[PDB]
Design a protein around this ligand. Sequence first.
Ligand SMILES: [Zn+2]
Ligand SMILES: [Zn+2]
Ligand SMILES: [Zn+2]
Ligand SMILES: [Zn+2]
Lengths: 114, 20
Amino acid sequence: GSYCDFCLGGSNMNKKSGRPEELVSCADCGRSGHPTCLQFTLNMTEAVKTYKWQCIECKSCILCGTSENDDQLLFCDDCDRGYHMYCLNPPVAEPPEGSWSCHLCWELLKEKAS
Amino acid sequence: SGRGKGGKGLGKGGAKRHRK
Ligand SMILES: [Zn+2]
Ligand SMILES: [Zn+2]
Ligand SMILES: [Zn+2]
Ligand SMILES: [Zn+2]
């Protein structure tokens, strides 16, 4: 049994606010979290509740999934796919170190169109 | 988010979050 590392309630409850939502546990730790307390975006929120929202610590790359440098890892808070900013297709050096979307989301982004 | 327990951190502000 997990819960938001920020309220420790239970998704349908934001305990610290007693309001409903939907946590996100780490597919490694189990540490759940409300995307509201996580500052996530919808797409993230929706993507992280279904697949492995490896807690930001286990987050690592997706282009490596090793954490390697983790000083470049770009955390797509649109699902949680970190990419050492020099792993991306348009690799950055600093630019969107935190936010920024990933490629799976993008190809899926463009796919969302039409 | 913003990584759990494991130290004190590396930042002293409030900008950006979630990394490790
Ligand atoms: Zn919460
Ligand atoms: Zn974890
Ligand atoms: Zn990488
Ligand atoms: Zn993504």
